[PDB]
Each structure stands twice: as structure tokens, then as C-alpha cells.
Amino acid sequence: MGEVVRLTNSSTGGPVFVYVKDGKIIRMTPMDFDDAVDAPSWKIEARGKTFTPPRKTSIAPYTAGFKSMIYSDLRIPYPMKRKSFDPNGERNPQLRGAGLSKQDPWSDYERISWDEATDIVVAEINRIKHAYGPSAILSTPSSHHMWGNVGYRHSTYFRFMNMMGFTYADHNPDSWEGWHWGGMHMWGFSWRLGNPEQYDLLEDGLKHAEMIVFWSSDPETNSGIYAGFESNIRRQWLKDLGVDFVFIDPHMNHTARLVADKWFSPKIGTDHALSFAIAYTWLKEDSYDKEYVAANAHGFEEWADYVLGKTDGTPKTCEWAEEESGVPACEIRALARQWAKKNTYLAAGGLGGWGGACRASHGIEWARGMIALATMQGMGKPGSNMWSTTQGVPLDYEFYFPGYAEGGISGDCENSAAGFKFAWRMFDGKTTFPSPSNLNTSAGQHIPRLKIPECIMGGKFQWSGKGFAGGDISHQLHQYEYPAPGYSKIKMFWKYGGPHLGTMTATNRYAKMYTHDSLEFVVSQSIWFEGEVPFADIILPACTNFERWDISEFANCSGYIPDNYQLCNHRVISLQAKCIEPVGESMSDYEIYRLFAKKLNIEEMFSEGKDELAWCEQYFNATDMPKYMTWDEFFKKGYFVVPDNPNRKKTVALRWFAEGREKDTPDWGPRLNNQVCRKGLQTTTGKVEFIATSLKNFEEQGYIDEHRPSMHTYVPAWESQKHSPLAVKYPLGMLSPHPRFSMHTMGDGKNSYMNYIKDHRVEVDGYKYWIMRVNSIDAEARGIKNGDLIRAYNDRGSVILAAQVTECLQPGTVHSYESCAVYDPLGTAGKSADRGGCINILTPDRYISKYACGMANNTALVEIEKWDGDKYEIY
Amino acid sequence: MEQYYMVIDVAKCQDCNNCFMGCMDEHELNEWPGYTASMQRGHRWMNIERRERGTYPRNDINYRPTPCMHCENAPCVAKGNGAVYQREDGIVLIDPEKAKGKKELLDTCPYGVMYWNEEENVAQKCTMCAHLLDDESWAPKMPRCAHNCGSFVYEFLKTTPEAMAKKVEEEGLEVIKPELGTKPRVYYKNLYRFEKNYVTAGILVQGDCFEGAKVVLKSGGKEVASAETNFFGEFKFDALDNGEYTVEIDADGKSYSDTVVIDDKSVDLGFIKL
Ligand SMILES: Nc1nc2c(c(=O)[nH]1)N[C@H]1C(S)=C(S)[C@@H](COP(=O)(O)OP(=O)(O)OC[C@H]3O[C@@H](n4cnc5c(=O)[nH]c(N)nc54)[C@H](O)[C@@H]3O)O[C@H]1N2
Ligand SMILES: Nc1nc2c(c(=O)[nH]1)N[C@H]1C(S)=C(S)[C@@H](COP(=O)(O)OP(=O)(O)OC[C@H]3O[C@@H](n4cnc5c(=O)[nH]c(N)nc54)[C@H](O)[C@@H]3O)O[C@H]1N2
Ligand SMILES: Oc1cccc(O)c1O
Ligand code: SF4
Ligand code: SF4
Ligand code: SF4
């Protein structure tokens, strides 16, 4: 009926040009710039060369095959209702997931209209609010979402929910665990949840870098986040400049596999033994920045005596560290000597912070160990800093464009970063208003995402901190309880998505909670029929961002990661065009909520008479875009390449701190009140506290926590091979990083093209199994061969996997990505082995420490064997 | 009469699978009349070979994206009975209709790049997105793999045989199975990473990694390679053909030598304590 039209949209894997014909998406590709209309790129002159980026964007694997997710046959077809669920009769809570228990998920549901589906949910909402109150309505989406600022959870979800209920299951700082509950007490950066700023580090590195230590860092795979493969050419530049690359990772990750000069594979939970041995070496050889430390460190003298083994009687030698980690002493020492004498940047994690190492039982000490090392070498001075090569791009930090974390249309000043700047631009206190929540606040009621099962099945819980406690260093130390004083226990659960079985900890418990009789109603508002969805009573079909109108900037999260668009080679702002009509009977989340708003008699207040496109234009006008083009011109062009800002002065991350002067970067902290004359870190002393004053106060107040000492020390990882009694039964150390070929659950399964990738899933007799990498020596010892179906197990459950024999792991260590989207129990749900590949069924649900209420997934002890075909219904 | 050529740099493959996802995106849900029916799930028109080498802790891995070689002297055109033809620009294409009902075509391929489509009852394979290359509207003017790369692996070009021959000699480009004489137009750069092997080790002196130790590799007694150990005391001699070699090491006047047998495997001599 027509011709092919090139449209624009984006995703968690990068912006894309979308070719559409007769209402069908033909292909999705990376973006080519048009030098006739797109501003020129930045240039960096360094060491005799001129570096400039490619005139194009790039995309991740899961975005390249994203079309198969849009047209997935596992896409939720239309509103669905659990057959065995009768709102006015037998609710049969015990039959939730029954289909799943008989390996026939779909048969559990019957089709129903949107009108009846919403009427049922509304009846439940009103009954529960008048009997127990809005707090009895539990709800939570999850960490990630389809790209698009207006439709993002911080925007649409919150705007509606804040007007309806509700008790939020606030998210634990998953991404930051170690840095958040640990590093924060040592150097602050609460507004970044423990991670360091990264401004203008690319040029500094190109000019001065001689070596980079990638610790728990796989920039290629992770890209920092949302940045496709934008940084690949930057490391190519560094490599060609003669910069050595050393990788310390239990698994020889993908970046290491490509450009490693040397690889270390430490046993799980033993990284801080290496950091301590490197420090010991610098102290014994006087090979560190004493002047720097004398001015910017607190409690270093006491810490030094600990590292030297004076106070505990155990000198932290490279030999001592070899016995702990399996990494050769000589190599540990050689790296220490090279690090000291060369301009070395510490690439802790793939973002400049983060790192799977941070969300493990040794997460706190790893994070502090990284800060300790980078501190000793004078981070901030030319040629020395914490930089993971993914950020620091010279983009125009002065141009303002909101990241999704800034709240969009919700204006929620407490649950989004709208309070920093966006809220003031987006709303006028005259014609458009925000949607605040008087429940999702400290004085209200929320529960930990990591402990939803315990709250539902146990009816009670007590913990530390509320979600992302980035307000100040001590906010995470605040004590909470469930149910909160005066509030009601959960009666209803409104789920947005359903990934927890593959993304949380010891996940069989998330399956178990659904059948508890205390749970009167479970609604699932999702896109694909997978994971947790087959446990709901009512299912509502949402659509992908390719089927609705939105707007966004390449990788721009902002909020707890201020100006993270610096992960890309260019700032690309694009219109997310509605490329096709919603698939099947699905609709945008906003339209779903608008329908509910109408039936809840709050339509006007919720929508303000605006549709998604209307909100997009208003969003557009609240940014700096109008300085370059009107909405109409932008809508027409489809995307905008922010011009370079050649003349702005460069402010390298932490240099101001290194030089003892006033903070001068564009960072969102430290707040003026957390500094004396705006100098120093957010910490009390304004220095790097090896003995954290905040924690020392906490422990002196009576909150004794052995696994989170005020002084950064070698706390043996509670789930490691030589320190846990569990190692007797489960001798193998397993780490489970983020999936290479999927943005967490968004890519895997769904009958997507990604499932055909060799290193993602292995087909065995018709079923594509999740992969677990095993060192040849451990495979051989178990009679396991490449391609065999194996059973990974421990006290928490069993998971069937396809074995991949490799040399990319130190013997005794196994590797299997997390975030599996497929939950496929071989027996009763939550009580049998899963063959979908939900490795998180095996990870420890114990908090990192008594008060550090974060997930410790990457240190899990397991045992594996060839699968005998049994279903193992023993959990 | 300009022809198409493609150059793949093995040293730069990270196996993110953007290529593969690129075909699928282009061929699984789409039909291209005159070129090919829709692709079958599970097929690998673009087959990214994976090969690990050596043993922990001095192991490594390399990848070889393998599409259709569209070789100049194509066996399936010769033995395809007209179901396969060669264009003037070098592209080798299967006739979507003439090929139906003939599973025998797959065997005319020394590289095994074609796959049988059950639903279409026909052999299918790499078309070098001839449909895209034949359409001016496709601004990129290159296949989907190459266009989807974010690792700068692909170099797509349309030039004369002379210019390509010149490029081959300057960059030392190679092809898969040259001995068969099909003359692929898809070249590989740094192919030794995937086809050859290496010998490596870590030299220690008084318990510490020794930097600057002189290492020499010999075959038949004559030097084949040499280098000095880095700060980790390591050296690595790659691109080795199968055979026996001798490694000689001199550090602080202290010498060490041992033999090494390379048999389609790379060897880690481990720590050499001097
Ligand atoms: N072993 C181990 N476990 C880990 C980690 C680790 O390193 N190791 N990493 C941890 C970290 S950092 C994180 S961030 C978590 C990830 O935790 P998440 O909960 O696992 O992961 P997502 O896959 O982003 O899930 C978001 C859900 O929202 C739904 N959704 C997305 N977009 C939309 C939309 O527009 N509308 C609707 N209605 N639904 C939508 C999706 O379908 C999906 O089910 O995993 C953590 N778990
Ligand atoms: N393809 C893809 N990209 C993603 C994501 C995804 O799901 N898929 N997730 C996005 C999100 S939410 C985030 S938060 C960022 C994550 O970005 P990062 O946090 O940088 O990812 P890593 O944390 O480095 O995960 C750890 C890497 O460290 C290794 N590792 C794991 N545990 C340890 C340990 O204890 N010690 C050491 N030395 N190494 C360890 C693993 O082998 C892995 O390669 O990634 C973003 N990018
Ligand atoms: O994965 C992290 C990165 C950005 C925002 C989040 O809410 C998160 O959990
Ligand atoms: S897209 Fe490029 S780096 Fe990725 S697997 Fe294919 S050739 Fe390799
Ligand atoms: S690789 Fe095979 S299919 Fe391609 S042209 Fe050569 S012989 Fe024919
Ligand atoms: S050239 Fe086109 S058909 Fe050939 S492998 Fe590449 S993407 Fe596929």
C-alpha cells in the first residue's frame, strides 16, 4: 500500500533508525550522521595524534535483534484472567502458578476484555482501600525499562501509582551495593550511591595513560550502561598508544578476550586480598603518593598498621593473597610495582564504579579496596585516577537535557531526581502539576524488593535504609519495619513486569510467595508472558516503546548517575516515533493508566487532558532543545546531535579534591552543607576515611556489624570457598554477571533471535538451555563434556544448564550469567529444578552484612554434575 | 567492471553477534523477491566461528565471522545446474525458485555456508544483501553485518581486481582454504589468530617476574622469532605452524632452553624459575 519510511526510536542498546513499510517494521539499524545537518564531533589532540569519533552511533546485540522481541509469540496477546480465580468466590490463591507446575503456563488463563480486566482490578483496589487503606496495595516494577523518558517507570508509573495507592517495594541499590553500603562511608558520593564522578577523563587518559587496570570490568559487554559499543574505539586508541591493559576477573570477560595484555582470575570473593597485597607492597617499598595521602586521607596510619599485619598479626603479603585467591604472588607484586611507577587508571567496574564484584559477600571491602588503591596513587592528578574508559567523553556538560531518572511527568521529588532541576522546568504551579506520594516516603510504608517474599509470607520484617539512600552518607542506616507503624499489611500486589525469579536472590522464594493465602489479588502489567507473569490473577498487555510516542537521549539516565550521557561519542537526542500500532491487544502503559484513572474518577488529574505525544512536547520545552530547534522541527528531523562545546574549560574528575581546592566539576554533589567552604569530600573530615567516621558512630551507637567494620579490613567473604562451611558440599565458586546478549531479562527468551547466538543458549533435543562455563579440569573430574546438560545445585535449588567447557576460568570457578527471562520448573513451581536457566535460584539471599541490606549474588557456592533427568522436587 | 570485496579483521572480533542479529533482522521476517525467501530460524548465513587456544592461565580466544565467500571460481555455480549464478560484480546468488527441491546444492559447497530451509524446501545462504546493494536508497551501501559492527571488523569495498590484489599484499590478507582454488572475495586480516598457534611462558628470577629477559624461538636451529619479556615476565610467539621448536631464554646472563611441540594447539610452558 506504500513505500518504506525511515523513522527514529531508541532502546537500552542505543538509538536506531527504523525502516517501516505498510505498518510493518522491516529493519532496525545504528544511526548514520548527516554532516550537512548534524553538528561536527569533538576532537582530542594527544601524544602527537588527533582523536575524533566515528560519525555514527552503535547498538548492542539485544537491540540489533530487538524486532524479534516486538513480534514475539510470547508477547502478551490480550488481557488474561486466571481461570481458577473468582473475585466473588473461591480465589484459590494456592493455585497460582498451577499451570507452571504442570509445565503448561498458558492453560492457566482465559481471555477477557480490557473493560472487564480493569473493572476487576478497580473493584479490588477500592475494596482494599476502604477496608485496609492504600498501603495494603503493594506494587513494584523493576530496575530496568523499555527506553523512553516520558513512559519510563520514574515518570508514567509513579505519576499514576502516586495517585492510586500504594506501598512501594523500593529497589535495593543493586547496581551499587558495595559502593553504596560500603564505599559511601569511606568517600561519600552519596548522590552517585558510592560511584565516582568521571568528567573530562578521556582526554586526560589519552594524554597521560600508560596502564589501565580493569578490575571487575568488562566495558565491551556492559558499555557502562545503555551505550552500545561507543567506547570500543577509545580503548583501540589507548592500545595503539602503547597503554597496557590488565584484567582481574574470575572470568576472562569479553573485553579481556579482545585486548588483554594480562589476565588474573581470583577465586570468588577474594579480590580484596589482592588490593591488600598491593597496598602492602606500596607501603613496604614506599611506592605511593605520601604527600597526597598525608593531605587527603583519614585514619591511614592505623590502616597502614593493619595492612602491615601489626595489629592482627598477619602481614598482607602477595603470598598470603595467593593462598586466598589463587592468583600468583609474583604477578600480584609485579602489577603492584608497575602500577606504582606508571600513570595507571583504575577501571573498577565497567562504569567507573559498579562492578559485579560490588554485589557479592565481599562487596563492601572490594569497593573500599578500590578507593584505597586509587587514593594511595593520588587519584585526580594527571595520569592517575579511577576511570573505566567508558565515561569522560568531552561532551557539552553545559547543555541540559533530562535523563529518565529525573522523573519525567511525575515530578516525584523523593522517588526520582526531579528535585534537582527538571521539576522546576517541567511544572509551573499554574497549568501542570506533579504527582507526589505521601506513602512512598520514609515516614510512610515501603518494603525491600529483596525481601518481598518474607514480608508476604512472614507478615513482618525489619531492615536498614529505604531503597537508594543517596540523600546523605547515613540515610542507609535509618531503621524501618514492616508493617510500618499504623499501616496495613499487603493484600494486593500490582506487578509491573515479572523478572525477579531470574534477577533477585535464592529466587525459589519469589515463586513460593504467590500462593500464600494472605495474598488476595495479584495483577501483572507486562509486555511478555514469561517469568513471574504466570502467577497473576489478572494480566494486562503493555507495548514496547516502538509502538508508542516518546522522547529520549542516548544512554541518559542522569539522577544517580549525573551526566552519564558522557558514555557515548556524541549526545544524541531522538524522537521515539510510534513506528507501528500496538501489537495484538496491548496498549502503552500510559494509556492503561489513563483508562484506570478514568474508572478511578481521577482522569483529569492524571492526564491533564494530554496524550503521550502532548506530554512529549511539554517535556521537550522543559529542556535546552528549544535553544536549537522548535518541537515541530525536532519532530520532523527525528533526532538531534548536540553541538560540541570546544571552548569550555576542562574539569577532570576529582582533580579539585586531589589539589585541595573547591569542587569545580558539574557534579551534583557534595551538597554545600557537607563541605567546609566547598572543599573536600562529603565525608565529615572531607577526606578519604579508611576508618569511616559515619560507621564508627553507627557501631558506637550499638549497631554491631562484624561484616561491615568501620575500618576497611580483610573481612573473609561469608560465601567463599575457604571461609564457608557450605564449601564442603558445594566446592565450586560461581559468579553470575550481567548477560552478554541481553539487557537483563529484556533480550533472552521470548523466542527472540538472541536465543540462536552460540554463546547465549545451546539447543539440546529441541530446547535451548542456558549456559554455564566450566573449567576443563572441573568438567573432566565430573565426566562432563562440552554441550552436556548439567545440574547446578546447592541448598537453595537446582537449575539445569548446558555446559561450556573453557579455559576462561580458574579451576574451581564456574560462570553463568544472570537475568534469565525464562522460568521453567520441571516440577512444582518453586520446589523443583528449573531448566529455564534461572541461576539466581542458587545465589545467597543473606544480606551483604547485618545492616548493609544489599544483594550478595556474585559469591555463590554450588556443585554441578551431569543431569540424570530427575526433576528434583525437594525445595 | 568493478567487483565487491569484504575484509574481516579477526584481531578485532569480540563475538557480540551484531552481524548475525543483523541478517536475522534483515531476512527472518522479510522476503526479498529475486534474491531469497525468508531465513529459517537456526540458520547461520553468517557463522561466527569460535576458537579457544592454550590452557589456563595463559589461554586466549579468537573469532572468525564466516559469511559466504562468494568465491570467484564458485563450485556451486559450476555444479549447481543453473540453480546458482554469478553476477558481474562478484556476488554469487542462488535462484530462490530454481533451487527448490534440491538439497544436493548444500554439498557443492566446500565451505558449508548454505542451509536447507524446511518450510521453503530450498537451500539458502549469504546473499551479501544484494537487494540492499542494488538499491540506492540504502544509504550505507554495505551489508548488514558490516553496518551493524561496532568493533570496526569489516571493510566493505567495490573496486578493481588490481586494487584489491594490491591491498592483499600490503595488508597480508588471507582466505580460508586457499588450496581449493575457489578464490574467495572475502578476506581475513590477522587470520593467524584463528588458524595458527603460539607458545608462551612466565620468566621468574629470584621469585619475581623478570622484565627484559631475551627470548628466541628456533625451528631447525634458525631463529624464527624473538622478544624481551614484559613486566609480567611473559613473551608470546604467535602465528606458528605445526612442528617442533626450541625456546631459548637469557636473563641476567642465566640461560634456559626447552623444546616445544605445536600440534594444532598452543602451549603454555608455565613459570620458568631462573
Ligand atoms: N547473580 C547476579 N544477580 C544479579 C546481578 C549480578 O551481577 N549477579 N545484577 C543485579 C543488578 S545490577 C540489577 S540492575 C538486577 C536487574 O533486575 P531487574 O528486575 O531484573 O531486570 P529487568 O530485566 O530490567 O526487569 C524489568 C522488568 O520490567 C518489564 N518491563 C520493561 N519495560 C517495560 C515497559 O515499558 N512496560 C511494562 N509494563 N513492563 C516493562 C520487563 O519485561 C522485565 O520483566 O539484577 C541483579 N541481579
Ligand atoms: N549486555 C548487557 N550490558 C549491560 C547489562 C546487561 O544486562 N547486559 N546491565 C547494565 C546494568 S544495570 C549495569 S548496573 C551495568 C553493569 O556494569 P558492571 O557492574 O561493570 O558489570 P560488571 O559489574 O563488571 O560485572 C562483573 C564483571 O566482573 C566479573 N566479576 C563478577 N564478580 C566479580 C568479583 O567478585 N571480582 C572480580 N574481580 N570480578 C568479578 C565478571 O566476570 C563480569 O565480567 O551493565 C549495563 N550493561
Ligand atoms: O541498574 C541501575 C542503573 C540505573 C538505574 C537503576 O534504577 C539501577 O538499578
Ligand atoms: S558484529 Fe563485529 S565484533 Fe560483533 S561478532 Fe560480528 S564481526 Fe564480530
Ligand atoms: S562459499 Fe560456497 S556458497 Fe559461497 S560462493 Fe563459495 S562455494 Fe558457493
Ligand atoms: S552480507 Fe548480508 S546476507 Fe551476507 S552474512 Fe552479511 S548480513 Fe548476512
Ligand SMILES: [Ca+2]
Ligand atoms: Ca602510579
Ligand SMILES: [Ca+2]
Ligand atoms: Ca581475540
Ligand SMILES: [Mo+4]
Ligand atoms: Mo544494575
